[PDB]
């Protein structure tokens, strides 16, 4: 019993964190095999950030301008290349702690663990989600650039995010491990703001099914809804549209609890209308949207209370 925001064990990622220095800038890098991956803005000054020509800045650098530190050991850079917004530094030593890994690009609503680092040293681990507006609500200070997001289903680490910047509202923007940004964001200090955010509907539904599995049903009602009528109501509360894919994905939780997806949608419509009235759901007074259907099946028991 119990339901917590749970992150993956971070050990396989800790053994990959290194410090990357270029002139006055110091940030974090991900050391996998003989390559160190880091944000390309490590080559910029604060002035360069308004309109950086990364290609012009990189061509002026040589291998020995990049200082890479792994623990108390200096690594030797023997090559360098840019791939989108990531810099790939070829080093002379392969990381003996390299785990089994993949680079995966995620979709909004997907969750992942973040290992927040400063000076190539891990300081904390937390769980978060890719928001529908492509930002993440993280906890990052200056020096955290290069910190990574990952999932560890089985013993394979799937790297999905690398931290690049903080937007004016305090939210964060970054790239997949191939250097492609999530969202319309650029690694430029330009006037850019996160779009209006929405609630991840399929995740709130999954979390309501987790509450039913843990023995709570106070929020259920005798009604059902069509998918269209649910979306017409949900859009009015800034909830993401629920698609037929979302309904199919919730199938296993629906069969386990005995409650149809469209009946759970009717409870959601009612919670949005009435609020919680002094009650909580899994120790929360708000509707939680940072647990996917997959996270709920992984964390919760296979036997409903």
Residues forming contacts to a second copy in the complex (CB under 8 A) are 1-12, 14-15, 115-119, 121-126, 128, 137-141, 143-144, 166, 170-172, 214-215, 280, 283-286, 298-305
Q: Please, what is the minimum distance in Å from the beta carbon of residue 6 to ligand RBX?
A: 14
* Distance (Å, whole) CA 125 – CA 132: 22
- Residue 149 binds which entry of Cl ion, a second copy, ligand RBX, none, CB below 5-8 Å type-dependent: none
Work out the number of other CB atoms within 10 angstroms of the CB of residue 295.
Answer: 21
Which residue's CB is nearer to Cl ion, number 54 or number 294? 294
Which residue's CB is nearer to ligand RBX, number 73 or number 141? 141
Query: Can you tell me whether residue 166 is helix, strand or coil?
Result: strand
- Residue 187 binds which entry of ligand RBX, a second copy, Cl ion, none, CB below 5-8 Å type-dependent: ligand RBX
Q: Please, what is the minimum distance in Å from the beta carbon of residue 191 to ligand RBX?
A: 11
Query: How open is the CA angle 127-179-34, to the nearest 5 degrees?
Result: 90
Which residues in the chain are followed by a discontinuity, with C-to-N distance exceeding 2.5 angstroms? none
* Distance (Å, whole) CA 135 – CA 257: 33
Q: Is 172 a catalytic residue?
A: no
Residues ≥6 apart with Cβ < 8 Å to 160: 103, 104, 105, 106, 110, 112, 149, 150, 151, 176, 177
State the catalytic residue, choosing from 16, 85, 117, 145: 145
Which residue's CB is nearer to a second copy, number 139 or number 190? 139
State the catalytic residue, choosing from 16, 22, 38, 41: 41
Which parts of this chain interact with ligand RBX (CB under 6 A)?
Answer: 1, 41, 49, 140-142, 144-145, 164-166, 172, 187-189
* Distance (Å, whole) CA 156 – CA 135: 25
What are the φ/ψ torsions at residue 150 (nearest 5 degrees)?
Answer: -155, 165
Q: Is 145 a catalytic residue?
A: yes
- Residue 110 binds which entry of ligand RBX, a second copy, Cl ion, none, CB below 5-8 Å type-dependent: Cl ion
Q: Please, what is the minimum distance in Å from the beta carbon of residue 193 to a second copy?
A: 14
Which parts of this chain interact with Cl ion (CB under 5 A)?
Answer: 106-107, 110
Of 135, 133, 138, whose CA–CA distance to 238 is shortest?
133
Q: Which residues are annotated as catalytic? A: 41, 145
């Amino acid at each position: 019993s119990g339901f917590r925001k749970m992150a993956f064990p971070s050990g396989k990622v800790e053994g990959c964190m290194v410090q990357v220095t270029c002139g006055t800038t110091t940030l974090n890098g991900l050391w996998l095999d003989d390559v160190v991956y880091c944000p390309r803005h490590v080559i910029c000054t604060s002035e360069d950030m308004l309109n950086p020509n990364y290609e012009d800045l990189l061509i002026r650098k040589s291998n020995h301008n990049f200082l890479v530190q792994a623990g108390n050991v200096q690594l030797r850079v023997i090559g360098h290349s840019m791939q989108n917004c990531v810099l790939k530094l070829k080093v002379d030593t392969a990381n003996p702690k390299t785990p089994k890994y993949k680079f995966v690009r995620i979709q909004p609503g997907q969750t992942f663990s973040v290992l927040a680092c400063y000076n190539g040293s891990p300081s904390g681990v937390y769980q978060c989600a890719m928001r529908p507006n492509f930002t993440i609500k993280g906890s990052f200070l200056n020096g955290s650039c290069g910190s990574v997001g990952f999932n560890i289903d089985y013993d394979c680490v799937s790297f999905c995010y690398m931290h690049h910047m903080e937007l004016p509202t305090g939210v964060h923007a970054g790239t997949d491990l191939e250097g492609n940004f999530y969202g319309p964001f650029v690694d430029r200090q330009t006037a850019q703001a996160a779009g209006t955010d929405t609630t991840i509907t399929v995740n709130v539904l999954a979390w309501l099914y987790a509450a039913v599995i843990n023995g709570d049903r106070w929020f259920l009602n005798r009604f059902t809804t069509t998918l269209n009528d649910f979306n017409l109501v949900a859009m009015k509360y800034n909830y993401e549209p629920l698609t037929q894919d979302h309904v199919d994905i919730l199938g296993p939780l629906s069969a386990q609890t005995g409650i149809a997806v469209l009946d759970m949608c009717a409870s959601l419509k009612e919670l949005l209308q009435n609020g919680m009235n002094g009650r909580t759901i899994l120790g929360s007074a708000l509707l939680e949207d940072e647990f996917t259907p997959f996270d709920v099946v992984r964390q919760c028991s296979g036997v409903t209370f």
